[PDB]
Curated annotation (Swiss-Prot):
It is found in: Cytoplasm; Nucleus, Nucleolus. There is a cross-link at K45, K47, K90 (Glycyl lysine isopeptide (Lys-Gly) (interchain with G-Cter in SUMO2)). Keywords: Cytoplasm, Isopeptide bond, Nucleus, Phosphoprotein, Ribonucleoprotein, Ribosomal protein, Ubl conjugation. This is Small ribosomal subunit protein uS11. GO terms for biological process: cytoplasmic translation; erythrocyte differentiation; maturation of SSU-rRNA; negative regulation of transcription by RNA polymerase II; ribosomal small subunit assembly; ribosomal small subunit biogenesis; translation. The gene is RPS14. The modification Phosphothreonine is found at T117. NCBIfam families: PRK09607.1 (NF007176). The modification Phosphoserine is found at S123.
Amino acid sequence: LGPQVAEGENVFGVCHIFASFNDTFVHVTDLSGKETICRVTGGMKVKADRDESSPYAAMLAAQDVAQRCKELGITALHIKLRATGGNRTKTPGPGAQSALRALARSGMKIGRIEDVTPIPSDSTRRKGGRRGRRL
RNA sequence: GUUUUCGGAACUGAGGCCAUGAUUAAGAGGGACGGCCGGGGGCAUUCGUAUUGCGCCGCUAGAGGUGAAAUUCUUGGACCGG
Ligand SMILES: [Mg+2]
Ligand SMILES: [Mg+2]
Ligand SMILES: [Mg+2]
């Protein structure tokens, strides 16, 4: 069920970890990034908008993704981590670290980590007003 | 008798003489000149991601928002990846 690769060699795919403050996306796709293998989110595991971005939902999503990818023959993963970016926050949400550790403990081999978040040169106007959000 | 002379003026042309006649260059100010200097200004040109939208491809059931939610977009493929 996948490529024919010797025991010593590992098949590589990239994993996009979109860690917003509303939920977390774990999205494994090919090295080229065009064909996807498993994409499950934190909202697909917890039925409560509160916990959509919790570390627990990210852990469950990462475990599901790692299991499906192992069933599909990929043993090594390339991690690229993204925050919301744009004019909004640049710090990744709480689910990123939990998802990374979850897919590490799931037997997956770890490639090289990279931080790919949209960093505007000089963006448009941020959503909040001149006085900003007041809550 | 009488036009000169003298006196007075104005208009004057050659001379001699003046120790011939211009204070200083403001820790005032202009204006020059030289090498620079600077997100100063105007015109044109060029690049950078990001945002939004569109086309195609993949897998897709959620995605968004919040203190918690709802309004809102979603198998007439939303969100995510290229
Ligand atoms: Mg002077
Ligand atoms: Mg529902
Ligand atoms: Mg897209």
